[PDB]
């Protein structure tokens, strides 16, 4: 990592990250076969099986109405992902595709099937509960007496049907579209097999095998539905087409100039992540779109907002910039600390006590009025009035782009005051 | 469904939906009776019962501090729903009401009780763990020795207290107010019985018996608390007063006009769902307020914003409109794809590659500069630079309202530039 404190606009740009951008989806259609639980009935008292059979029947009948119907659409990453998943889900819903998938999965536990849409999917059968129900449960409950005294069947059924109950709970809570791949929809072995079956290069396979909990959080599951006795649901694993490209995170604080008790401040809107898919800067505003795991940053291209390559001029000279740079201006600012990945930049004004100090020396020093950058090497704790912030313990290359603050030269007495999405090259000439 | 692309403001309006508006609440007060678990004690080692008895005691002790106290209020749908629920919760908290409810539920498993507030609630007793604990859990634990060798009661207790433990976990995680009715608070049989007991017409009963997976999400549960040995909590099922009235979703993209490298664009802020409760348009700004399940759209009237019927002029002619139509204007636009329920409208500007193509033909065509509407029949995939979007597979009636873009006639060289809240009728004349 390498963090540069741009003093002109009072911002911090942290480079040295590496992109992992999800570009596509890979469909793994699981067919959890339950069996003929509906035909089996119990009329005696609670015998450790009638209660569990009733719970299984309730789950199966509850799954019928939680079919993941077509959404309302949108523009965010989750809306595009849901639409893309439902596009293949509706093709699967047709009788021909489901019949072919079940037929090919009847003999073997895995299929590589091409749908009528032209997409290739991996069909997985997890029919372990069905085998137990058909072989053991029906044999012991040939009659209507469910009070078998072996007690083996009760605990075995409790163990086998746990995954089905968890799947039902997740799909009912999430209305058929779970937000992430849990440990119940697709286990570790199935995840490894699906990754090994994916059509992708060796480096992406290695990266996705190392970070299994970031592949379980970028994907999701969609419930095709209950056909006959089989609950069929698809899992959309991510495919990271763009990998190992430079990224940088930009954080901003309100830079202020004041006189006679009147302030004038600017804060950059262009905070968040920037990456480069292929010769085109992509800007992610929301911090929930991109998640960092080490030096790698995982992002979704659906939420990416394309930005021109000229946007790099915002980090060089905004006073005489050619590309219009976005700044929100105001007066009577807000004192706050923005924790950069390496250090932290603090901007406190008016009557606010501000200090930095380590854990073994005490209060190292006080902050002069105006925003300041604090590395994690020269300080360990930042105090703002009474609030205490603990800085990071990561190491990196800290630089300071020396210069004059821009807001120091824009007449702090009175300013045009353009707040929401106003540039600087033309709005504040 | 039927989607019309208005080219005057470059926005897609999709009609043909049917409202399901939650207008009221129905209270189902569950009294989960646990028993005299506190009196029982185990002094031996782990005997498959001491561990579970300790877990039950810990859950019961934890439930004391997670009482759903009165909230801080608010203006959203969740705040109003919480306040309405707590209004009956405080009435139930009185000793007379809870004593009467428990007295009527002592003999029968269901009650229809009228509170002193005047509201009518359905009292349900799920006292299955209590019976086992009282008679045949305690029969073998007359002494302090919990190491019974039959081993059947251990697994039976594990089966019986699962619902209680799940309820405790949900109420502790959600601080007493769960966001939705899970499978543990109210099972499918109890949900169906409560629906059958509700005072509503046959149409609503059929609709919400075919859509239990959305009724479980539109409701919630509030914990009254632990009285004696009984955990009392109410579930607030939704009552859909206004049903099957026309609704339409409006989505917008930035319509732009540019010259000499200078842009000027407008985007409609009034995106989202519109419905008609009774002769009055209601607008839902947040996309999480309304959820579509097929052609029906389920909404909450608490989050609705009343809008005058004159707002229909926003979809006919905004250049010479009488009703003030809200637009957010700006330059230096954003290239993005808004996925309409039927098709998708793409607005890409500056140096951004834009194309559409099917899955078989390849790249069908290249999109000219300016926002364009793409149906799901003439194209199957939309490519913007590197990002790829898959269109929906639903069928409907697509229309294009031909005309001239409004922003094309408002001097793209320089424009008043009001973004957050201004109307095109008398701010951008």
């Amino acid at each position: 990592l390498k963090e540069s404190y741009l003093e002109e606009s009072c911002s911090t740009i942290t480079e040295g990250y590496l992109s992992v951008l999800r570009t596509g989806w890979y469909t793994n259609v699981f067919t959890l076969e339950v069996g003929d639980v509906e035909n089996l009935t119990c009329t005696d008292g609670p015998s450790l099986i009638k209660t569990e059979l009733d719970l299984t029947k309730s789950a199966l009948r509850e799954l019928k109405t939680c079919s993941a119907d077509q959404g309302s659409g949108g523009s965010g990453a989750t809306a595009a992902a849901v639409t893309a998943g439902i596009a293949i889900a509706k093709t699967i819903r047709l009788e021909s595709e489901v019949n072919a998938i079940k037929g090919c999965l009847k003999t073997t536990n895995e299929c590589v099937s091409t749908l009528g849409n032209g997409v290739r999917v991996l069909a997985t059968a997890v029919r372990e509960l069905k085998e137990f129900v058909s072989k053991n449960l029906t044999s012991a409950i040939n009659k209507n007496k469910c009070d078998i005294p072996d007690l083996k069947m009760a605990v075995s059924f409790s163990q086998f049907n746990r995954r089905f109950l968890n799947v039902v709970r997740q799909f009912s809570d999430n209305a058929g579209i779970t937000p992430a791949i849990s440990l119940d929809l697709m286990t570790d072995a199935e995840l490894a097999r699906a990754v090994s079956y994916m059509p992708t290069s060796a480096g992406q396979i290695k990266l996705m095998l190392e970070n299994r909990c970031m592949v379980r959080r970028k994907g999701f599951g969609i419930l095709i539905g209950v056909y006959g006795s089989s609950v069929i649901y698809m899992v959309q694993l991510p495919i990271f087409g763009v990998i190992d490209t430079p990224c940088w995170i930009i954080k901003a604080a309100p830079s202020c100039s004041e006189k006679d008790g009147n302030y004038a401040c600017l804060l950059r809107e262009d905070q968040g992540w920037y990456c480069k898919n292929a010769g085109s800067t992509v800007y992610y505003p929301n911090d929930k779109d991109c998640e960092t795991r080490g030096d790698h940053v995982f992002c979704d291209t659906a939420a990416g907002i394309n930005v021109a390559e000229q946007s790099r001029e915002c980090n060089i000279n905004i006073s005489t910039t050619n590309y219009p740079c976005k700044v929100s201006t105001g007066r009577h600012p807000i004192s706050m600390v923005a924790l950069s990945p390496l250090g932290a930049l603090v901007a406190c004004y008016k009557g606010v006590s501000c200090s930095i100090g380590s854990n073994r020396v005490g209060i190292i020093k006080q902050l002069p009025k105006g925003c300041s950058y604090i590395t994690n090497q020269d300080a360990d704790t930042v105090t703002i009035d009474n609030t205490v912030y603990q800085l990071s313990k990561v190491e990196g290359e800290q630089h300071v782009i020396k210069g004059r603050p821009v807001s120091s030269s824009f007449d702090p007495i009175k300013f045009p005051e353009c707040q929401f999405n106003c540039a600087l090259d033309q709005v504040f000439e | 469904l039927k989607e019309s692309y208005l080219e005057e403001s470059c926005s897609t309006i999709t009609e043909g939906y049917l409202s399901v508006l939650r207008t009221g609440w129905y209270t189902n007060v569950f009294t989960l009776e646990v028993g005299d678990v506190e009196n029982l004690t185990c002094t031996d080692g782990p005997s498959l019962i001491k561990t579970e008895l300790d877990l039950t005691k810990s859950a019961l002790r934890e439930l004391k501090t997670c009482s759903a106290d009165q909230g801080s209020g608010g203006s959203g749908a969740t705040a109003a729903a919480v306040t309405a629920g707590i209004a009956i919760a405080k009435t139930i908290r009185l000793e007379s009401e809870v004593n009467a409810i428990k007295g009527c539920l002592k003999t029968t498993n269901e009650c229809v009780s009228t509170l002193g507030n005047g509201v009518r609630v359905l009292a349900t007793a799920v006292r299955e763990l209590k019976e086992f604990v009282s008679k045949n859990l305690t029969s073998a634990i007359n002494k302090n020795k919990c190491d019974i060798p039959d081993l059947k009661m251990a697994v039976s207790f594990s089966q019986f207290n699962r619902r209680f433990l799940n309820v405790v976990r949900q109420f502790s995680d959600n601080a007493g107010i769960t966001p939705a009715i899970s499978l543990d608070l109210m099972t499918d049989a109890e949900l169906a019985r409560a629906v059958s007991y509700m005072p509503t017409s046959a149409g609503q009963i059929k609709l919400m018996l075919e859509n239990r997976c959305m009724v479980r999400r539109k409701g919630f549960g509030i914990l009254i608390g632990v009285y004696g040995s009984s955990v009392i909590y109410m579930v607030q099922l939704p009552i859909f007063g206004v049903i099957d009235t026309p609704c339409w979703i409006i989505k917008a993209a930035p319509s732009c006009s540019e010259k000499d490298g200078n842009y000027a664009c407008l985007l409609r802020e009034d995106q989202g769902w519109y419905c008609k409760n009774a002769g009055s348009t209601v607008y839902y700004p947040n996309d999480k307020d309304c959820e579509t399940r097929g052609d029906h759209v389920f909404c909450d009237t608490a989050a609705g914003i009343n809008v005058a019927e004159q707002s229909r002029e926003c979809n006919i002619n905004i250049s010479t409109t009488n009703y003030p139509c809200k637009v957010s204007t700006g330059r230096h636009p954003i290239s993005m794809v808004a996925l309409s329920p039927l098709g998708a409208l793409v607005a890409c500007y500056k140096g951004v590659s834009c194309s559409i193509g099917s899955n078989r033909v390849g790249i069908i065509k290249q999109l000219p500069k300016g926002c364009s509407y793409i149906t799901n029949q003439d194209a199957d995939t939309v490519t913007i630079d590197n990002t790829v979007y898959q269109l929906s597979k639903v069928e409907g009636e697509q229309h294009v309202i031909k005309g001239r873009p409004v922003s094309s006639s408002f001097d793209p060289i320089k424009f008043p530039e009001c973004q957050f809240n201004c109307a095109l009728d008398q701010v951008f004349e």
Epitope: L18, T23, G24, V112, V119, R120, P199, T200, S201, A202, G203, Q204, K206, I239, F240, G241, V242, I243, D244, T245, P246, K276, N277, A278, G279, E309 | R360, V361, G362, T381, N386, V388
Partner: single-chain antibody, 231 residues
Framework: VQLVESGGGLVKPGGSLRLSCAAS????????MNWVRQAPGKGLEWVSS????????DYADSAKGRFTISRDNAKTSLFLQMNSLRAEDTAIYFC?????????????????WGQGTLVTVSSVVTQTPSVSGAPGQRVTISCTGS?????????VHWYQQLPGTAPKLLIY???NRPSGVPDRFSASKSGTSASLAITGLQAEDEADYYC??????????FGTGTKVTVL
């Protein structure tokens, strides 16, 4: 935008040779790069890869360890060092950019190629050996592959190479088409085989056509090379 090549000099067998490729006109730090060698008379062959930050690098399963690849983003330069090259390494080497849509499968396509340099000493996909005909009508070229290259879900790309000319991307991502290519070229992939159809070919279409897909075993396999002729 172009990739100047250098370093293709005569070398004795068992020696070392350094080839440099300088790319001008694009962000060199965001594009993966590749080496493709073509023997004097045979088809194109993949050599080595390099990512956008030199963290992942894959090699063809014929010169692992023997060759090495590196890049420096400071001056936007790339280098290939060949150590102890054999007598079969006499070929024209092309430094090629790489782009991957990644929507369905990750199969990079070599959109921009360098002129290449000549080096001399002192589950493979296959397609039709050659096609012929007359101007005016339609011709087809079929590139068949095993279950690891096209049957594994990987896409198929088609490049057209004139005699004594750097190859040019013709079809990318199954059936799409780049700018500057006439619409008379069409492509279609089915199951395990791809097909390129040329409708109403002119006299300037006389060039070799190569199909490129991705393997699970040996990455970046190229086709055997079909030659079209015009009467």
């Amino acid at each position: 935008v172009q990739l100047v090549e250098s370093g293709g000099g005569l070398v004795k067998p068992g020696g070392s040779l350094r080839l440099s490729c300088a790319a001008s006109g694009f962000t060199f730090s965001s594009y993966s790069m590749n080496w493709v060698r073509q023997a004097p008379g045979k088809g194109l062959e993949w050599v080595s890869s390099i990512s956008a930050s030199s963290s992942y690098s894959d090699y063809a399963d014929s010169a692992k360890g023997r060759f090495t690849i590196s890049r420096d983003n400071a001056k936007t330069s790339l280098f290939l060092q060949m150590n102890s090259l054999r007598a079969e390494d006499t070929a024209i080497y092309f430094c090629a950019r790489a782009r991957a849509t990644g929507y369905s499968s990750i199969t990079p396509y070599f959109d921009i190629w360098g002129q290449g340099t000549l080096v001399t000493v002192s589950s493979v996909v296959t397609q039709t050996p050659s096609v012929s005909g007359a101007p005016g009508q339609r011709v087809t070229i079929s590139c068949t592959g095993s279950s690891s290259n096209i049957g594994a879900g990987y896409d198929v790309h088609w490049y057209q190479q004139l005699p004594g000319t750097a190859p040019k991307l013709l079809i990318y991502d199954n059936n799409n088409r780049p700018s500057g290519v006439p619409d008379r070229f069409s492509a279609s992939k089915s199951g395990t085989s791809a097909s390129l159809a040329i409708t109403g070919l002119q006299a300037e279409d006389e060039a070799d056509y190569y199909c490129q897909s991705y393997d699970r075993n040996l990455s970046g396999v190229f086709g055997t090379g079909t030659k079209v002729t015009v009467l």
